[PDB]
Amino acid sequence: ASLTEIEHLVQSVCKSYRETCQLRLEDLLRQRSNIFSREEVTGYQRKSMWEMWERCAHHLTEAIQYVVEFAKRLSGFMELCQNDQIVLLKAGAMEVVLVRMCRAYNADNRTVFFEGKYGGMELFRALGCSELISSIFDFSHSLSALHFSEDEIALYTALVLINAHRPGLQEKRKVEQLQYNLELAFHHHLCKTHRQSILAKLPPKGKLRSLCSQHVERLQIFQHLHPI
Numbered sequence: 001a002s003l004t005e006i007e008h009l010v011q012s013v014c015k016s017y018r019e020t021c022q023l024r025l026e027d028l029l030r031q032r033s034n035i036f037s038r039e040e041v042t043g044y045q046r047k048s049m050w051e052m053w054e055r056c057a058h059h060l061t062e063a064i065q066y067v068v069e070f071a072k073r074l075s076g077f078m079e080l081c082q083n084d085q086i087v088l089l090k091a092g093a094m095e096v097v098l099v100r101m102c103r104a105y106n107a108d109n110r111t112v113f114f115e116g117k118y119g120g121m122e123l124f125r126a127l128g129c130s131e132l133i134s135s136i137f138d139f140s141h142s143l144s145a146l147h148f149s150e151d152e153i154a155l156y157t158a159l160v161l162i163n164a165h166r167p168g169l170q171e172k173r174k175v176e177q178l179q180y181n182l183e184l185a186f187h188h189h190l191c192k193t194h195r196q197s198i199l200a201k202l203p204p205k206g207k208l209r210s211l212c213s214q215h216v217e218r219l220q221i222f223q224h225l226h227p228i
């Protein structure tokens with residue numbers, strides 16, 4: 001497990017991320033001043049829940065598609081048996097979606113890029129899950145503090161997915177080995193770039209876990225009311 005191997009692992013993970021990032025950070029950053037007007041916000045607030053759910057189901061499934069492709073390009077993932085790939089994605093893909101979202105979050109005015117412009121949490125009231133929406137915003141705000149580089153997001157989201165503790169893995173040893181090498185790669189890269197200090201600012205588990213569980217509960221309610 002050589003220095004050159006760890007360097008190439010950082011490079012491949014970063015490349016996999018660039019190939020599947022959905023939106024370019026430069027585009028997201030240049031759009032920050034493009035904010036929904038008061039009239040456009042009212043427009044969204046007046047939409048039915050049904051309509052907002054159809055819209056947001058589309059955005060969710062699109063985001064998940066990119067995360068699945070990221071995993072499949074990730075060095076070492078395709079070595080796992082199909083069962084274990086499925087276990088890791090079922091457990092981790094939404095978590096990656098939520099982490100990726102901080103790139104599209106502007107902490108200065110607490111807005112997120114959505115359907116072409118930046119809007120705050122009040123844009124989403126018609127969905128009828130106020131707690132969840134503000135939990136998403138709060139999670140994004142907490143990640144915003146780290147000012148992740150694109151390479152750090154790549155490595156961190158790889159580790160969100162490659163977690164040997166997920167229940168139901170058939171080849172736990174295999175996943176442990178992959179995780180061990182990605183952790184070494186992450187920390188090697190942080191020290192190389194003088195960015196170790198972001199580790200102490202990564203958030204407490206209970207936030208995201210609650211978040212993904214909250215999402216799961218609300219998704220089931222939407223599917224009941226309006227199966228897609």
Ligand SMILES: C[C@H]1CCCN1C(=O)c1nc(C(=O)NCC(C)(C)O)sc1-c1ccc(C(O)(C(F)(F)F)C(F)(F)F)c(Cl)c1Cl
Pocket residue numbers: 023053055056057059060063097098101104112113114115124127129132133136214215216218219222
């Ligand atoms: C912004 C989030 C919260 C408000 C609406 N929304 C999206 O539509 C959305 N967008 C995503 C994305 O990656 N887009 C890329 C970019 C950020 C650049 O715009 S991903 C996603 C998303 C959709 C639904 C849920 C639900 O849990 C909900 F709505 F309840 F919160 C579910 F409907 F599934 F139940 C959840 Cl959490 C999420 Cl994160």
